[PDB]
Amino acid sequence: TSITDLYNEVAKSDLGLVKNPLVSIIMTSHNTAQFIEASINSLLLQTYKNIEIIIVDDDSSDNTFEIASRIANTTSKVRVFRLNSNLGTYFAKNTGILKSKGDIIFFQDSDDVCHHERIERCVNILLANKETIAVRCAYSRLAPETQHIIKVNNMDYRLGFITLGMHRKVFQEIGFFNCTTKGSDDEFFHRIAKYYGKEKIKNLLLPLYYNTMRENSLFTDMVEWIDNHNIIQKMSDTRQHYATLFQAMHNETASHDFKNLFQFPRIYDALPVPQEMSKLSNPKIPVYINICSIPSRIAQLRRIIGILKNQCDHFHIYLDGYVEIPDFIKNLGNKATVVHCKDKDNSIRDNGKFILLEELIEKNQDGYYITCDDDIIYPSDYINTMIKKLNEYDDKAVIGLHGILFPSADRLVYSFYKPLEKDKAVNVLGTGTVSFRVSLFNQFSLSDFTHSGMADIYFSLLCKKNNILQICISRPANWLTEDNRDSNDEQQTQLIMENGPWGYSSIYPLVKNHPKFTDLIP
Ligand SMILES: O=c1ccn([C@@H]2O[C@H](COP(=O)(O)OP(=O)(O)O)[C@@H](O)[C@H]2O)c(=O)[nH]1
Ligand SMILES: O=c1ccn([C@@H]2O[C@H](COP(=O)(O)OP(=O)(O)O)[C@@H](O)[C@H]2O)c(=O)[nH]1
Ligand SMILES: [Mn+2]
Ligand SMILES: [Mn+2]
Numbered sequence: 333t334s335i336t337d338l339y340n341e342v343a344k345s346d347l348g349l350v351k352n353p354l355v356s357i358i359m360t361s362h363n364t365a366q367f368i369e370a371s372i373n374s375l376l377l378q379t380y381k382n383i384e385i386i387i388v389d390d391d392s393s394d395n396t397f398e399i400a401s402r403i404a405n406t407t408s409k410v411r412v413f414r415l416n417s418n419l420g421t422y423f424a425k426n427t428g429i430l431k432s433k434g435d436i437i438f439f440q441d442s443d444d445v446c447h448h449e450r451i452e453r454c455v456n457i458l459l460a461n462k463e464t465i466a467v468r469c470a471y472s473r474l475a476p477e478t479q480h481i482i483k484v485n486n487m488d489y490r491l492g493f494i495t496l497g498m499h500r501k502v503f504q505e506i507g508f509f510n511c512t513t514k515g516s517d518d519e520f521f522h523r524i525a526k527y528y529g530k531e532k533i534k535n536l537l538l539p540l541y542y543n544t545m546r547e548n549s550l551f552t553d554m555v556e557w558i559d560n561h562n563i564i565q566k567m568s569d570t571r572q573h574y575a576t577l578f579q580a581m582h583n584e585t586a587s588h589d590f591k592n593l594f595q596f597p598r599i600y601d602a603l604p605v606p607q608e609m610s611k612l613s614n615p616k617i618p619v620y621i622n623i624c625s626i627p628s629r630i631a632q633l634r635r636i637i638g639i640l641k642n643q644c645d646h647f648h649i650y651l652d653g654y655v656e657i658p659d660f661i662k663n664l665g666n667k668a669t670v671v672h673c674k675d676k677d678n679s680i681r682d683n684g685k686f687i688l689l690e691e692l693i694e695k696n697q698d699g700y701y702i703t704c705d706d707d708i709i710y711p712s713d714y715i716n717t718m719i720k721k722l723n724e725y726d727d728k729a730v731i732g733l734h735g736i737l738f739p740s741a742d743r744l745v746y747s748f749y750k751p752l753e754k755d756k757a758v759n760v761l762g763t764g765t766v767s768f769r770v771s772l773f774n775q776f777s778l779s780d781f782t783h784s785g786m787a788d789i790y791f792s793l794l795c796k797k798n799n800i801l802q803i804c805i806s807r808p809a810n811w812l813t814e815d816n817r818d819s820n821d822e823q824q825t826q827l828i829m830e831n832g833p834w835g836y837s838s839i840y841p842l843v844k845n846h847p848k849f850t851d852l853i854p
């Protein structure tokens with residue numbers, strides 16, 4: 333049995349052909365450069381014309397993202413994004429959902445292809461009854477050399493989870509995919525069934541999706557080969573433990589609670605799983621995000637709070653000159669400490685990013701201390717990637733994106749929105765992009781930041797006087813981006829020149845004395 337027999341099966345059936353909302357197909361990729369163009373091509377060939385194709389590359393080390401970026405330049409139907417650390421297909425999926433604009437959401441993996449009528453037929457079945465919330469069709473495993481069918485538990489094709497399509501409102505009503513490495517398509521399907529009722533999912537029993545069979549893929553811990561055209565598929569022990577867990581959770585949790593249990597972005601495991609099942613950063617100390625904001629940027633601050641609010645344990649928000657506290661701030665509740673300054677005479681401006689740091693050190697409380705600015709668009713993977721990078725240096729250094737190397741025309745600037753191919757030590761980090769572990773510092777007085785408006789310089793001096801390196805970390809182009817939206821260096825100079833030495837002369841002693849720091853310099 334071959335892919336041709338599957339196509340013959342579809343051509344004998346009129347299911348879904350008699351009838352246009354925008355459909356978003358979400359694709360994730362991890363080191364699939366050999367396959368991804370054929371995958372995308374099968375989607376561009378859909379008979380259903382009103383599509384967009386959303387690609388999220390999960391930090392591939394091959395040139396997968398180069399290829400996807402090229403294709404996006406050949407057609408406006410394809411939009412591509414890259415995560416700056418490996419977080420797993422469900423994190424990448426959820427990121428793609430946030431980027432998507434369609435009213436109806438389908439999926440396709442970057443190593444597969446599908447039938448040119450998959451979206452048309454599934455959409456028409458989905459929309460046949462207004463009570464239907466989702467649809468799915470059948471898949472087959474295909475040997476990529478011969479395109480012969482690999483039967484799964486004695487069936488040429490069977491209903492799957494990758495073939496699900498559903499109304500966009502599902503994610504706002506029941507939350508997002510659980511951010512594991514595997515098994516969460518099964519959980520999400522059962523979450524839909526639990527919340528909406530299993531009859532509100534329609535099955536289209538046609539072989540319209542073709543799963544490539546390849547070594548070391550996610551599902552191969554389930555596979556027993558019987559012969560060249562037959563496998564048995566059975567949950568592994570860790571997969572079964574996860575299923576037993578989420579099945580109990582579905583029975584123990586009110587269905588209107590799913591939305592809160594499975595928020596996205598996130599940094600902590602929603603369900604307890606072993607390390608093989610999660611790539612989340614799962615910090616073992618709290619995460620503290622600190623931000624200052626002026627009222628001209630209230631629209632930017634809304635977007636920032638919305639993307640960051642579930643990437644931390646607690647906000648410190650210094651509102652400088654806002655008249656009233658925005659609803660999106662008050663809705664944080666006691667998750668935020670809001671300092672509201674009304675008199676510009678009392679304002680400390682950007683020094684407000686470091687109010688909490690003094691409090692934590694005074695209380696001997698540790699944490700990941702994050703400083704942000706209200707004119708930057710932060711990505712969904714931001715905090716997970718930053719903590720992973722701190723951990724890569726055993727939390728011994730400060731990291732950031734916006735970096736400056738001194739010897740003002742001779743300064744080298746590593747703008748946070750431009751690419752950087754490897755980590756590099758620098759002299760000053762922009763404090764809208766900094767992350768570090770609090771307990772690097774055993775004493776700190778914010779009053780030492782005498783003048784406002786120069787927090788990057790003062791923070792750099794705090795690092796230098798404590799023999800702490802500042803690392804400008806690698807990232808793709810536009811991982812972060814600016815949204816300034818239309819919103820006298822005499823003290824800086826005096827402070828810079830009075831606090832020599834700079835350049836590589838302040839860096840090289842630190843770099844030379846620790847084997848994990850050696851590649852940070854030419
Ligand atoms: O860390 C990872 C591993 C996999 N994938 C993607 O997740 C999808 C499903 O993985 P796979 O093809 O291995 O699944 P299987 O064929 O085993 O069901 C594919 O687009 C993979 O490239 C990903 O984004 N991140
Ligand atoms: O009077 C001011 C000026 C700036 N800021 C905040 O300080 C940070 C840095 O401001 P800006 O983006 O203007 O600095 P730049 O990026 O130009 O160095 C931002 O979060 C601003 O909201 C503030 O609270 N008060
Ligand atoms: Mn696959
Ligand atoms: Mn700025």
Ligand code: NA
Nearest residue numbers: 363392393394
């Ligand atoms: Na590779």
Ligand code: NA
Nearest residue numbers: 518519521522
């Ligand atoms: Na199941």
Ligand code: NA
Nearest residue numbers: 610611612614
């Ligand atoms: Na983890």
